[PDB]
Amino acid sequence: GSTLDKIAKNGVIVVGHRESSVPFSYYDNQQKVVGYSQDYSNAIVEAVKKKLNKPDLQVKLIPITAQNRIPLLQNGTFDFECGSTTNNVERQKQAAFSDTIFVVGTRLLTKKGGDIKDFANLKDKAVVVTSGTTSEVLLNKLNEEQKMNMRIISAKDHGDSFRTLESGRAVAFMMDDVLLAGERAKAKKPDNWEIVGKPQSQEAYGCMLRKDDPQFKKLMDDTIAQVQTSGEAEKWFDKWFKNPILVSHNVYITADKQKNGIKANFKIRHNVEDGSVQLADHYQQNTPIGDGPVLLPDNHYLSTQSVLSKDPNEKRDHMVLLEFVTAAGITLGMDESKGEELFTGVVPILVELDGDVNGHKFSVRGEGEGDATNGKLTLKFICTTGKLPVPWPTLVTTLVQCFSRYPDHMKQHDFFKSAMPEGYVQERTISFKDDGTYKTRAEVKFEGDTLVNRIELKGIDFKEDGNILGHKLEYNFNNPLNMNFELSDEMKALFKEPNDKAL
Numbered sequence: 001g002s003t004l005d006k007i008a009k010n011g012v013i014v015v016g017h018r019e020s021s022v023p024f025s026y027y028d029n030q031q032k033v034v035g036y037s038q039d040y041s042n043a044i045v046e047a048v049k050k051k052l053n054k055p056d057l058q059v060k061l062i063p064i065t066a067q068n069r070i071p072l073l074q075n076g077t078f079d080f081e082c083g084s085t086t087n088n089v090e091r092q093k094q095a096a097f098s099d100t101i102f103v104v105g106t107r108l109l110t111k112k113g114g115d116i117k118d119f120a121n122l123k124d125k126a127v128v129v130t131s132g133t134t135s136e137v138l139l140n141k142l143n144e145e146q147k148m149n150m151r152i153i154s155a156k157d158h159g160d161s162f163r164t165l166e167s168g169r170a171v172a173f174m175m176d177d178v179l180l181a182g183e184r185a186k187a188k189k190p191d192n193w194e195i196v197g198k199p200q201s202q203e204a205y206g207c208m209l210r211k212d213d214p215q216f217k218k219l220m221d222d223t224i225a226q227v228q229t230s231g232e233a234e235k236w237f238d239k240w241f242k243n244p245i246l247v248s249h250n251v252y253i254t255a256d257k258q259k260n261g262i263k264a265n266f267k268i269r270h271n272v273e274d275g276s277v278q279l280a281d282h283y284q285q286n287t288p289i290g291d292g293p294v295l296l297p298d299n300h301y302l303s304t305q306s307v308l309s310k311d312p313n314e315k316r317d318h319m320v321l322l323e324f325v326t327a328a329g330i331t332l333g334m335d336e337s338k339g340e341e342l343f344t345g346v347v348p349i350l351v352e353l354d355g356d357v358n359g360h361k362f363s364v365r366g367e368g369e370g371d372a373t374n375g376k377l378t379l380k381f382i383c384t385t386g387k388l389p390v391p392w393p394t395l396v397t398t399l400v401q402c403f404s405r406y407p408d409h410m411k412q413h414d415f416f417k418s419a420m421p422e423g424y425v426q427e428r429t430i431s432f433k434d435d436g437t438y439k440t441r442a443e444v445k446f447e448g449d450t451l452v453n454r455i456e457l458k459g460i461d462f463k464e465d466g467n468i469l470g471h472k473l474e475y476n477f478n479n480p481l482n483m484n485f486e487l488s489d490e491m492k493a494l495f496k497e498p499n500d501k502a503l
């Protein structure tokens with residue numbers, strides 16, 4: 001048959017999407033799947049509705065990784081994906097690729113004051129690469145052919161590879177140039193990094209679909225070709241690759257079978273009013289309060305973003321917070337509670353915090369609602385002791401992760417809801433770089449119908465003239481990213497003449 005036959009039969013089109021392929025397919029500030037490649041997916045979805053003449057077609061999404069994107073495509077769990085999947089002949093034995101939507105070149109990322117100008121300069125030096133990529137093959141081929149005596153480091157992913165370069169453990173990072181810029185956009189100081197070298201190869205990114213389906217491929221190729229030749233694709237490029245984009249935070253969770261709980265590690269980069277960044281290092285552990293059984297999860301992360309605003313009719317020191325959380329990082333298809341039912345509806349929230357920072361005592365109270373079904377939070381906090389001695393953004397992470405939306409395939413990894421209604425104890429250590437430290441102990445539990453979060457906070461060794469006690473932090477909670485990636489001549493030529501050839 002054909003994918004269009006199955007779509008018209010079931011009345012649904014299932015779209016596969018990456019979870020953290022910035023800026024091709026990723027979660028934005030509201031946990032919505034956006035990106036340059038996701039713009040092609042929307043156009044393809046609209047073209048399917050017109051081809052089949054079914055304007056009421058349902059559109060459902062599914063998160064995919066490089067692990068399960070081919071098996072789940074082959075058994076029909078989803079119909080197509082538009083992200084950064086590279087077109088090659090090996091994958092063409094397993095599936096099909098649409099017209100190319102992005103062309104890259106394998107180059108080098110290096111520090112701006114070094115000696116790395118081209119690939120020949122890598123001789124006798126340590127070069128980092130991401131395992132499994134074509135760059136690892138090309139870099140090894142160049143090392144063996146030219147006898148370069150290179151110490152090649154193969155890291156787990158691109159973030160690991162860049163942090164190898166950022167820390168100085170390698171002199172250059174070789175990968176597709178657009179992914180080098182993506183890792184540069186998330187750097188401590190993106191201004192320090194430079195893309196150099198002549199491309200060792202060209203790689204083509206294409207939307208993937210099932211093999212031996214010319215009907216569905218023709219529709220995707222026709223939709224992609226029209227978007228590119230008409231100039232709509234260049235406008236998408238400038239919006240995503242030459243303009244600021246909003247990205248979610250990631251809270252990585254690991255199990256802790258010793259204490260029947262979990263641990264968490266993440267960093268928050270508070271913006272300073274002078275343009276600099278105040279780093280906040282979060283170390284977290286959660287222990288169940290009751291003796292019953294709780295869910296112990298595999299390694300996964302929470303995609304979180306919070307919007308900070310002000311009540312214009314509130315005279316007290318306050319913070320209005322909207323939060324959007326989703327769980328991610330667990331491969332659907334390759335993965336072997338009572339409190340979950342307590343969050344099926346909208347749950348009232350009460351937050352009470354007693355704080356002590358360098359002797360400055362204060363208290364904060366918060367009300368609102370939690371929607372775990374949609375992974376949504378809305379809360380208004382008020383400093384009941386008068387003025388807040390610390391900036392409001394420093395207290396955001398301290399002031400109820402049981403309201404995160406765990407998708408249906410991840411529900412067995414939800415420790416937070418599983419510890420309810422007895423709840424859990426949340427202890428944190430927040431190390432502000434070149435400043436003081438927060439020490440937090442919180443009890444999160446159900447008091448009646450209300451989710452309650454009582455916190456005791458102690459802050460020590462803070463500079464009275466620092467970014468915290470001096471109120472030098474901006475009233476926001478995001479770090480806008482800019483790829484600063486120009487439209488290459490290959491991308492211009494591709495938009496003029498769309499094709500689906502592997503490179």
